[PDB]
Write a protein that binds this ligand. Sequence first.
Ligand SMILES: COc1ccc2nc(NC(=O)C3CC3)sc2c1
Length: 119
Amino acid sequence: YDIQAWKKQCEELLNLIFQCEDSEPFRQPVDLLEYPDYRDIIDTPMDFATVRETLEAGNYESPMELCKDVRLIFSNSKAYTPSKRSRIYSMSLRLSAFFEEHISSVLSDYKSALRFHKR
Ligand SMILES: COc1ccc2nc(NC(=O)C3CC3)sc2c1
C-alpha cells in the first residue's frame, strides 16, 4: 500500500522503453524540419524524454497522468501516420502493447494504495 511506489516503477519502465529499439522514433520531440506539417495535424506533441523529465521534475502527481502522456505519444503517431502499415506507426503499436502490459500493475497498485489510505 505504498502511495509513492509508482514513481520508481515508472522510472524503471521508462528505462526499459529507452532500451527497446521500437522507442527510437519517440525518444525526443518529432523533428519539425523532417516533418514540416507535423503541427498542422498534432496539437500536443509528446515524447519519452519529455515524460521522463516531467517525472523527474516532480511534475506528475500520479501514474495516471504519466500514462495519459505516454498514450498521447501513441495517439500522435496514429494521427500522423499516412498508413497503418508505416514503419514508425508499426513500432508505436508494439511499444504501446509493451507499455500497457507493464503499466497495468503500476496503476492497480497505486489505486489500491490510495483506497487503503482513505479506508
Ligand atoms: C512523427 O511520427 C511519424 C509517424 C508515422 C510516420 N510514417 C511515415 N512514413 C513515411 O515517411 C513514408 C516514407 C514516406 S513518417 C512518420 C512519422
